[PDB]
């Protein structure tokens, strides 16, 4: 009932004794290796904290310290990016010409002829063209010199040291108690108000005082050396008053409720900046101000130590209807005692948010000179999409882990979870039917178009000229958003994005953003996306609902979450565990996201990206998406065969490395097929013959060589499949978008 700081002093002694004893965390692995399997087990159960001990307090302490280690790794990575931008980049030269100089922040040493990778990126610099977009982000923050990036790198190293010290201090010196981790109300209040709200407020302050004046002078044509330093802008009111007249009144209009006076640096312009092609920084600053106020308000909702506030348990218990039985009873205890359930929810929303970020980032470019950098836009969208899909599959995996290990039927007599498990057969059957319907009505259209096109009957295809399938709902929504600034948004000067409609914005002769029209091909690819997402959901949901029992194996929960099978009985029970469902869901997620990024690349290169000429806009592929994306042959010829030319003839140039990876990625992927299509019995017998040859020459190791386990074989195969396919698409996309974009 009382929210306080509960900490135990010196629970674990800092020593190197356990560093010399591998597998000490596990009772089974502490005995030592006898076979090679042990080694793999040593890495497969290193972070399985709930498997080492049943004490929730110890698991929570390990998780909290592991989080600090992860933050330290992230800080080291960020510090490295800032250091590379400050010592091995051309950011200063790129600032004076961001429309001609290619961003580069990696240089290779002149060894074994690899110096060819240091391409001529411009600005009297030789290096590898980066696509992370750090140059645009640094330009948006107001960074004009390498000294600022170097100082940020040193600060990042200091923060990393602090994170590692915090993890050690919280695991060996001052470890929090279990009741401290269970303060979900206090934690949510702090995360909403403090973390999110204060971070948005601080970033709004930086944008108002540094990003806005520096970027205003940069867009006005002032040289970065002549632009005043951020502290000079923050020290006197004369410079800020000249750039923004409202600064002459100080913070007085904020306290006198005269916020309208600050309209010079807090606007609702919308659209994009015609000079840089990105969002108006005044709009982003005002956005962060509103976000900070909203999150600060949201951070005062839960009850912590006073009468005011809300109790999440009471709110969950008060929501009960006649169609759901008890309702959310027991959900508060489930989320306050199981880390896997929280990880499942957080991973699902986190992956969905990453995908939303990718979409909003390409549609509304927030950084200056970001939209015209087609390589950065394509790479950012693809990267965030992949991260989102991976996190979603992980969410399904942890939901299944919770259902297998932390589920308790005594606390779920007639709740929502109990009823869901009770009618899981109906849920899975209906989802199976909708998946089959979507597959037929999505893929069959392409097959029908391919057949009609091959039979010399283009009038019977599902195209714009022939029988069309226009997305009337999406077009209506686009028109509504385009017409919004005149009726439903009187204070908005322009629309949120140019994709809805209107005129195009071009920077440096390249289309930064133009309207995106949707036709029959868009309708077909959208239904393809819906079908693939539905199948991935079907596999993950089936693995979660049928994780404890099924009509085939009634005691699956006793077999655990990750087990190979239950024998060749009952016709064969291969891949019945929830782990195998996650294993198949990874493949389906790869398929879905690959088609998604393929559609994005073709649509952007065909109807959006391109150069600007006299009375007309010429695209990269010449607008062939509406005519060729309705057939599989069109995707194979006009998109895969035509655009792969840049990566296959990249040899002898700076992009040759991409070509090499393009071949290497085809290897790893094919390598995966050896593990996915074979079984460990064959490999074990082959190892027996090799061990015989070793025993003949007295070179047989003491640690008995064993073939990989069935689960390990599946994991290795799916890992290599994902790595090879994603790396293939990465090499193809980057080489093509850097050579022609």
């Amino acid at each position: 009932k009382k929210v306080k700081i509960a900490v135990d002093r010196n629970p674990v002694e800092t020593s190197f004794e356990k560093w010399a004893k591998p597998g000490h965390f596990s009772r089974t692995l502490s005995k030592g290796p006898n076979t090679t399997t042990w080694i793999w087990n040593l890495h497969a159960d290193a972070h399985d904290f709930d498997s080492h001990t049943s004490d929730l307090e110890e698991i929570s302490r390990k998780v909290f310290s592991a989080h600090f280690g992860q933050l330290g790794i992230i800080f080291i990575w960020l510090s490295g990016m800032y250091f590379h931008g400050a010592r091995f980049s051309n950011y200063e030269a790129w600032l004076s010409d961001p429309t001609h100089i290619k961003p580069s922040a990696q240089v290779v040493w002149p060894i074994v002829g690899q110096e060819i990778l240091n391409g001529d990126v411009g600005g009297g610099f030789q290096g590898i063209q980066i696509t992370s977009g750090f140059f645009q982000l640094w330009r948006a923050s107001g960074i004009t010199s390498e000294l600022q990036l170097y100082t940020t790198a040193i600060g990042g190293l200091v923060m990393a040291a602090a994170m590692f010290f915090a993890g050690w201090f919280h695991y060996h010196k001052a470890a929090p108690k279990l009741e401290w981790f269970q303060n979900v109300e206090s934690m949510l209040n702090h995360h909403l108000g403090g973390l999110l709200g204060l971070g948005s407020l601080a970033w709004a302050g930086h944008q108002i005082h540094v990003s806005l004046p520096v970027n205003k002078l940069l867009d006005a044509g002032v040289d970065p050396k002549e632009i005043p330093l951020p502290h000079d802008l923050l020290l006197n009111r004369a410079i800020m008053a000249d750039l923004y007249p409202s600064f002459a009144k100080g913070i007085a209009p904020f306290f006198t409720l005269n916020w309208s006076e600050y309209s010079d640096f807090l606007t609702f312009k919308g659209g994009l900046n015609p000079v840089t092609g990105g969002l108006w920084l005044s709009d982003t600053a005002h956005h962060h101000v509103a976000i900070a106020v909203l999150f600060l308000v949201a951070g005062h909702m839960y009850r912590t130590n006073w009468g005011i506030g809300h109790s999440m348990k009471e709110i969950l218990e008060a929501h009960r209807g006649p169609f759901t039985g008890e309702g959310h009873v027991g959900l508060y205890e489930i989320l306050t005692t199981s880390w896997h359930a929280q990880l499942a929810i957080n991973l699902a929303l986190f992956g969905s948010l990453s995908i939303i970020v990718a979409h909003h980032m390409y549609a509304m470019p927030p950084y200056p000179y970001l939209a015209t950098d087609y390589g950065t836009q394509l790479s950012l969208f693809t990267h965030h999409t992949w991260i989102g899909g991976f996190c979603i599959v992980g969410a399904g995996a942890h939901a299944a882990i919770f259902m297998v290990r932390d589920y308790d039927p005594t606390n779920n007599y007639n709740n929502l979870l109990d009823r869901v498990i009770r009618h899981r057969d109906a849920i899975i059957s209906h989802l199976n039917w909708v998946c089959i319907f979507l597959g037929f009505h999505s893929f069959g259209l392409y097959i029908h178009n391919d057949t009609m096109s091959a039979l010399g009957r283009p009038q019977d295809m599902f195209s714009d000229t022939a029988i069309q399938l226009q997305p009337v709902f999406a077009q209506w929504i686009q028109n509504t958003h385009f017409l919004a600034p005149q009726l439903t948004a009187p204070n908005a000067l322009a629309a949120t994005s140019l994709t809805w409609g209107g005129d195009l914005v071009a920077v440096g002769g390249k289309v930064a953003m133009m309207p995106i029209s949707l036709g029959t091909s868009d309708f077909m690819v959208h239904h393809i996306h819906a079908f693939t997402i539905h199948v991935t959901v079907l596999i993950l949901l089936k693995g979660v609902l049928f994780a404890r029992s099924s009509r085939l194996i009634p005691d699956k929960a006793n077999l655990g979450f990750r087990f190979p099978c239950d024998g060749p009985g009952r016709g064969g029970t291969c891949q019945v565990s929830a782990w195998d469902h996650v294993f198949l869901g990874l493949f389906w997620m790869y398929n879905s996201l690959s088609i998604v990024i393929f559609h994005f690349s073709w649509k952007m290169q065909s109807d959006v990206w391109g150069t600007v000429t006299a009375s007309g806009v010429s695209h990269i592929t010449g607008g062939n998406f509406a005519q060729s994306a309705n057939t599989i042959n069109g995707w194979l010829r006009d998109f895969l065969w035509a655009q792969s030319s840049q990566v296959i003839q990249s040899y002898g140039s700076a992009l040759s490395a991409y070509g090499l990876i393009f071949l290497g990625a085809h290897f790893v992927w094919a390598f995966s097929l050896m593990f996915l299509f074979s079984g460990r019995g064959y490999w074990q017998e082959l190892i027996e013959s090799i061990v015989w040859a070793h025993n003949k020459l007295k070179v047989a190791p003491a640690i008995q060589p064993r073939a990989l386990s069935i689960t390990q074989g599946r994991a290795v195969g799916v890992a290599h499949y994902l790595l090879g396919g994603i790396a293939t698409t990465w090499s193809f996309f980057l080489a093509r978008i850097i050579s022609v974009g």
Binding site: R551, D555, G567, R570
Partner: protein, 80 residues
């Protein structure tokens, strides 16, 4: 139906009977081991072939073997 066989190398540890999920095996008195017991398969018509009994056997080689034979409703573990 599947064929389940018990061999004389059985030590009577009763681990195969405890691991059987359909009550196919049992223990009968015997004199060939210290435990004075031996595994038996008098209800092979209910065996599904999961081979859990072989996984639970500690003798080298196994004392219980399951050979997949004819398939029926019971051997396939069908509830429909």
């Amino acid at each position: 139906a599947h064929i389940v066989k018990i061999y004389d190398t059985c030590i009577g540890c009763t681990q195969c009977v405890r691991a059987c999920p359909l009550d196919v095996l049992e223990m009968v008195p015997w004199d060939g081991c210290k435990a004075s017991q031996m595994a038996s398969a008098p209800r092979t018509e209910d065996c599904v072939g999961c081979k859990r009994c072989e996984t639970a056997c500690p003798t080298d080689f196994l004392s219980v073997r399951v050979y997949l034979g004819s398939e029926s409703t019971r051997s396939m573990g069908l509830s429909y």
